[PDB]
Amino acid sequence: EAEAEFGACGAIASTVPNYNNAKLPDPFTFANGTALRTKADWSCRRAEISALIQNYEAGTLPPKPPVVTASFSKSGNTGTLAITAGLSNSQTIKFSPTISYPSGTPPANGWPLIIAYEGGSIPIPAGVATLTYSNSDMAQQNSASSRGQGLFYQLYGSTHSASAMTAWVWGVSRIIDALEMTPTAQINTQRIGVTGCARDGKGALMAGAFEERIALTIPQESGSGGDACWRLSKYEIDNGNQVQDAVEIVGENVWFSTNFNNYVQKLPTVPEDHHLLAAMVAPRAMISFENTDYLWLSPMSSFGCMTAAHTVWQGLGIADSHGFAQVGGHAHCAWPSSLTPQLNAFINRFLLDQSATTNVFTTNNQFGKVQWNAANWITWTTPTLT
Ligand SMILES: *[C@@H]1O[C@H](CO)[C@@H](O)[C@H](O)[C@H]1NC(C)=O
Structure with missing residues (x-):
């Protein structure tokens, strides 16, 4: 509705005041009750999901500012x-990420590139350039004490509602703006991925979800607030798994908006969960990796959340653009060589243009004191979007 005022997607909702659903929100129904039917509908539903996530847990993601050099x-x-970024009121900030290049002549269209939060913790193949993004400089993340601290807030103000992770996304968007205006950087801006581990994996998922110029998103052991769902993690903690959950996470750090504090004890009233956050990557590609050795990461929650998110890619006819691999037997953020073929399949297909197959959706089901029962969490039937 109101397309004449808001554009093709109409008056997308930023709130759903009467929402109360203990199970996972339905990806395929808009806030107004309209069912999604076409692939084009997904674009609008993604925009609505973006608004809902910003309202309830992420804070405001500012658009591109008028000065980016x-x-x-x-x-x-x-x-x-x-990079320099500036507002219409003359305020500016500056930041200078570095890029590690393969040697020699690049491909005709430039090097594919992975933007790695704090360098990442995945092995990046020799033909892909690595940009080291100091997300912690953009928004600090030491503890609750870090609220409103970082370069982003030196531009927008320390009371700006953006969470630290939303500020990090904004920085990634400025990096891509910079690359698109800097041909001497020799980057193929159509082949950019993003990655990070642990807290930086929560960040990388946010970046791929919100910044549509990212061709491949790779969150590694991101846990609660990453590829786990809030509702499933509450189920885990209530049943004795020692997981991180919404209640603890908002007191531990500044990865979420202060407004989220009003909802962490009332998760059924939040008209989104992280399966919708992950689905915002669609129709682009993502593979996330999890580790069952650490109950803090909320293992069942990640598998259930990503299974729910996967239905969006299934409904779009592109299931193999979304992968999930969950294993045990290695230290947190150590890369197990057993998963290298799966990682490389996604990089090879989506950044290197190879004919690699990317059907990867696997877990060891080592979930501790809970089990995953899809019927208890997913109530929708996946449509074939036209
Ligand atoms: C429901 O909301 C979506 C998103 O704003 C919009 O595309 C759709 O047209 C709305 N339905 C009606 C009947 O207006």
Whole structure:
């Protein structure tokens, strides 16, 4: 409705005041009760999900500011991309991520690139450039004490509602803006991925969800607030698994907006969960990786959440663009070589243009004191969007 005022997607909802659902919110019904039927409908539903997530847990994601400039220099195989961002009131900030390049002549369209939060914790293949993004400089994340601290808040104000992770997304968007105006950086901006581990894996999922120029999203052991769902983690903690949950996470750090504090004890009233956050990546590609050795990561919750998110890619006819691999037997953020073929399949297909198959959806089912029962959490039947 109201397309004449708001555009093709109408008056998408940012709140659902009467919502109360203990199970996972239905991806395929808009807030107004209209069922999704076409692939085009997904674009609008994703925009509504973005608004809902910003309202309930992420805070406001600002658009591109009026000033974004960049200069580039290189020494050896390391480039420095010096970025300036500024508002209409003259306020500016600056940040200078670095890029590690493969040696020699690049492909005709430039190097594919992975934006790695704090360097990431995945092995990046030799033909892919790595941009090291200091997300912690953009928004600090030491503890609750970090609220409103970081470069983002030196531009927008320390009381701006963006969570630290939303501020990090904004920084990624400025990085891509900078790359698109800097041909001497020799990056194929159509082949950009994002990755991070642990808290930075929560961040990488947010970046891929909200920044549609990211071709491949790779969250690694992101846990609660990442590829786990709030509702499923509450079920886990109530049944004796020592998981991180919504109640604890908002007191531990600043990864979510202060408004989320009003909902952490009332999760059924939140008209989204992280299966919808992950689904915002669709129709682009994502594979996330989890580790069952650490109950803190909420293992069942990640498998259930990603199974629910997967229905969106299934409904869009592109199930193999979304992967999930969950194993045990290795230290947190150590990369197990057993998962390298799955990681490389996604990188090879979606960043390197190879004909790799990407059907990866596996778990060991080692969930501790709970089990995953899909019928207890997923109530919708996946439509074939036209
Ligand atoms: C329901 O909301 C969606 C998203 O704003 C919109 O595309 C759709 O047209 C709405 N339905 C009606 C009947 O207006």
